[PDB]
């Protein structure tokens, strides 16, 4: 009768940057989604693959507890088959993804007067991300064919820029915290069913 530790994840003091995604494997416990199924604080309980209306009777192999914080308008891009900066160079969802995306506004915790500068994102990349992949490289991006030579130069730019969240922004620019619960199931006994 081990309760999966979903709790300590939602109310953590801080979440890492957009490009430094956090992965936790949750296996060999019991997870009950009926706690938040009726509560509904979230603007979106949008789910894909599994219907939230009492489908916890099935068995899954592992649970991924992806978590981060982004801008508001970009919440959409956390959806299958959509292309935008966040999708292109930051986090990816396969079209076939099964699991739940839940998001809420947390301006109050995140926003700081004078700006909060601890959340960052990668503007340009040589190519596109492949599925569920992490790039933490800080090497300078080069657009020019002439060599960058490792210095700031014409057509040479550092990859990451800061969100700079501030209290007086519109609903689109205000910080939104996103948690993606992915139910990974393969050919396995799948002890993580969550009765």
């Amino acid at each position: 009768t081990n309760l999966c530790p979903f709790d300590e994840v939602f109310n953590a003091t801080t979440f890492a940057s957009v490009y430094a995604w956090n992965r936790k494997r949750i296996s060999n416990c019991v997870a009950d989604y009926s706690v938040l199924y009726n509560f509904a604080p979230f603007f979106a309980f949008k789910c894909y693959g599994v219907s939230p209306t009492k489908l916890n009777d099935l068995c899954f192999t592992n649970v991924y507890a992806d978590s981060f914080v982004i801008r508001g308008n970009e919440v959409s891009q956390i959806a299958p088959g959509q292309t935008g900066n966040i999708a292109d160079y930051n986090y990816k969802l396969p079209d076939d993804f099964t699991g739940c995306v839940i998001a809420w506004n947390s301006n109050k915790l995140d926003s700081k007067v004078g700006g909060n500068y601890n959340y960052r994102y990668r503007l340009f990349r040589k190519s596109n991300l492949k599925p569920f992949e992490r790039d933490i490289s800080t090497e300078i991006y080069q657009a020019g064919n002439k060599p960058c030579n490792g210095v700031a130069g014409v057509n040479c730019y550092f990859p990451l820029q800061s969100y700079g969240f501030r209290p007086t922004y519109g609903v689109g620019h205000q910080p939104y915290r996103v948690v993606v619960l992915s139910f990974e199931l393969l050919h396995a006994p799948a002890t993580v069913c969550g009765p």
Partner: protein
Amino acid sequence: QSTEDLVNTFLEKFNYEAEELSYQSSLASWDYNTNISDENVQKMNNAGAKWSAFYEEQSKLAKTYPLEEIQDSTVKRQLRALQHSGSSVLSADKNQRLNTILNSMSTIYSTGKACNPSNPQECLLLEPGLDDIMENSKDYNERLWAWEGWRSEVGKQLRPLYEEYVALKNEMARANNYEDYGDYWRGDYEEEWENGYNYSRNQLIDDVEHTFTQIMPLYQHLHAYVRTKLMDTYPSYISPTGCLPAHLLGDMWGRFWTNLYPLTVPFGQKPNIDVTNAMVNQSWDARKIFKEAEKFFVSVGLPNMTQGFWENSMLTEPSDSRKVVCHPTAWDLGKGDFRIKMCTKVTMDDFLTAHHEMGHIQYDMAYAAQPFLLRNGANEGFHEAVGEIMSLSAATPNHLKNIGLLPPSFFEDSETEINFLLKQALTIVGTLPFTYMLEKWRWMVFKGEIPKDQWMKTWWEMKRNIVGVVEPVPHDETYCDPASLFHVANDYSFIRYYTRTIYQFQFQEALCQIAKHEGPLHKCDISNSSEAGQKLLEMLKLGKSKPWTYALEIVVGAKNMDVRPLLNYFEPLFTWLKEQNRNSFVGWNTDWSPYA
């Protein structure tokens, strides 16, 4: 790699860097304006510098990319803007000199004083004082002392400086490849596009001219009516055939003739509609005024205001300690924040003003999606116009009844209608001739048609021929009369005003047709019709992405300015005016002088 490719990456770097620096600058200005303290001034200055530094260095960075190579319209429009290359072209020493001259001139205007000949002690500055005499007094002699005075002291000082300014500016322009400074200014209305949407710099001159010729018959009649009425108040001075003497027209420079309403009311006994008293009776408050406005906008179809607006804006005169700048203003700080600052008192005029200001905000909200460089109105004129259209609708007798301010059974009469129209005309028709003249003089001076020796002579001649006003006292070359007006001495373009007016009416007629109004255009109300809103919205969203000509077409169906709509609005008045002056002479003879 195409330069197109290189260009697109560059443009992405700039976009995020630009918005954040701008927001900071803006926040600082709001703070100063709301709480005026010395410390605040400092912060504002520091932040502003950073933003400018960014723009300048970036602009310099981008003169490098060839303009011709890019083959997509949107990208091109953006690159062009960053590449404007204004002012930096001049050598540093020259730049420094120009800056000094510009500053000196602004100071003289603000601090200038003029004195009563009769009482040496009394000396008055412009804003508090000289203005009042001009605006409210009815004595011939008094008015004269003031007119001459501003001109004699502030003006004479300004002339030597102006001459230098003309030369330097012209040099700057020549370097940037426009022919003269005038061309640079007309450049704003220039568009290059493919299918018959092209407008050229030269064409503006022709169009303005054509339109004026059409408006002339109305002006002539109005001029006559005023003349006859004025004759009663200052009996000896005015002459039946001749032009109106200048000092008697209602403001120091003559721009608007509105102050003459008391003297000229057509049908005096019936009173104008004012709802101020009622508002007090029903206990409306400042927020109530704003709240009502929102409802109008919602009814047409545009979106409701955001939560932030309600919380952060300063809708009321600040109580207690802070000191506040008073102009009614609308602010788009950026990154989503929209705020309005004004002090509201429960008066009818404020109801009307609120509607205008909110209008400016609604446009802004709409163009947000477009990229940073392109987020602005299509041509300078459009922004103001959008706002005005809204106000006209609100003032109509019908709207006021529905809100409940007016009593239920009021029925207007012919007399009241005429009275309303005249008031409007003095403000709108009266301004148009003046604007045309000023701009023409300036364009010519810059080009070189008028030699320096003859600058003053020409000004007066032109006024007599086009606007029908004559000098009270002879003015020699040393004086520099055009300079006194604020815009002239603070380097701004004055064309925007003529164009805006023509546009407003055009928009209104079109919208009204969709809304199915039947009757005189003066009574049209767009309220409660969704369709109208949608059409306007389509234009608003474009921003500067597409050429101005294209935009006008979407709402009104034509690619060019036309003055037929204005004439229709004022048609009921025209007929009346014609009957009234049937006996009197219409026209002016340039010969008469009050110089005598």
